[model samples]
Target: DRCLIVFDLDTKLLEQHYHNSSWRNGYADIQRVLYRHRFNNIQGTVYLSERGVRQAHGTLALQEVAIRFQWFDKCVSNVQFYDLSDDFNAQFIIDGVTQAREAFERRIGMLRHQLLDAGLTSEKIEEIIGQQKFSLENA
Candidate 1:
């Protein structure tokens, strides 16, 4: 024991860690993800230093960590909340969805025709395609 290199957590680190809300408490939304993955999480209780806006200061529960970094960065100053999705980059996203939906629907329609040609009859073919939720929308 005399010559061993020893390390213990600094007292401030230990004491400061307690600023978090009770470690035993889990967010309901949080526990669903955490219980599945077996990860740990903590909620940083808002302090007078942060003007009580809320915080999370430790290794976190992911999406909540995403929420925390924003919270912590916002604590410092006023920042512009610009719409990065300006054109609703959504239609751009929507582009591929509809594009693929149409292409696949065309492909599926051919499958329907070929299946019908294979003698399954139109009724079961329609009903069977209906089994896939993608069945009728493109029609």
Candidate 2:
């Protein structure tokens, strides 16, 4: 059995991340595009422990090993013994997100035109777009 653990970052880090809050959905699209980008390898450290054993370390390697051994869930459940910290290049993330937002806006414009051609009024279209709530499912 597995349980999820929620970790809170320090206030300074939270504020930095919050700066890109408006580009929330935009970042997901950025990651999708950059998944194939050659320079998109962002690596960091991660630690996990299970039953008094340090099962894994490093971001990618740990995740892969944890899932393979079915130890990820157990490690997370023991929150007191599990901890992770990673540093991100904020400027890199910002630049990638900027490109993503531009691409998304372009696609949205094309979609808007398609809807309009299908007889949807501009006001109604705006309403639909405005009411959109960002979520993992829709993202």
Candidate 3:
């Protein structure tokens, strides 16, 4: 499968996808530098290949390549989450992100049992809702 690698400068995250085994066909590179574009809010593409990895600004050192490899490994480790080409599948995660964010914002100050009743796992709730917000009134 051909490999598709995307570097999100804004988030400093790497996203990759594989489709066929003919990835050795050739190396194709594209760049997008935009301040306000319709895409995922990022800029530019750098040189990346199975043989080696480099950036447009400069070539990656051995240590840098190792670090980059780790990034790629973490990404490909969960391949299904990266399979966003499918509209349905993509929408599902999009919805999840939105729901998670909303639940986080709206459930503030609620007790632990309240959050559980609202359907948020303890871990999820803990991640975003670490401490509660409260107000005090005195006469």
Candidate 4:
């Protein structure tokens, strides 16, 4: 169970599943160039800084791979709604990694648009990644 990570408003979030050779797997190293004029340090909650966005990007990237590779077919995916604020944690069976990925895409898209409206540039938006992140530049 190779799980990726994310950050939701300063929290260390974890997302299950990934692709065989996903960008998320090789994402950490690119952090240096990706984040400029931002803070980098994960102590306790980490906060909603670039690190948070980085983690979110990683998670979203992994989901894109899973979806591209149809990783969710073997797993069960579902959304659990809670009354604990406006945040909702996504969870599902590791088998349905593909469908889960699609679900994640839609979810991340929402996040992306929300962030974009909040002054976050489309390029700066992390979680809602694309195939290019997986190295499919030609696709």
- Could you tell me which residue pairs clash in candidate 1? none
lDDT of 4 by residue, 8-51 (tens): 34322232223333334335533432343232433212112234
True-structure lDDT of candidate 1: 0.38
- For model 3, residues 1-139, the per-residue Cα lDDT tens digits are 1234443344323223223322223323322211112334233323334543223211212223337456432222222122122223222534443444344444353655576787878886665454433311110
Candidates 3 and 4, the one with greater TM-score: 4
The whole-model lDDT of each prediction reads 0.38, 0.40, 0.35, 0.38
Q: How close is candidate 3 to the true structure, as a TM-score?
A: 0.21
Residue 108 of model 3 has an lDDT of 50
The local distance difference test score of model 4 is 0.38
What does candidate 1's lDDT look like per residue over 32-118, in tens digits?
Answer: 433443433443221111221112221122234236455433212111111111222222433333444455556667888888898
> How far is 1's C-alpha from truth in model 3 (Å)?
11
| Residue pairs with backbone overlap in model 4 | 71-97, 71-98, 72-96, 72-97, 72-98, 72-99, 74-95, 74-96, 75-95, 75-96
What is the TM-score of each predicted model, taking all chains together? 0.31, 0.33, 0.21, 0.25
Positional deviation of residue 9's Cα in model 3 after best superposition, in angstroms: 25
lDDT by residue (1-139, candidate 2, tens digit) is 0111223466775466555342334444344434434334665321222321232332234345446556343322222122222243434433333344455455566767787887889986555654662212111
| Top candidate by TM-score | 2
How many clashes (backbone N, Cα, C below 3 Å) per candidate?
0, 0, 3, 10
Ordered from best to worst TM-score, the candidate numbers read 2, 1, 4, 3
Model 1 steric clash total: 0
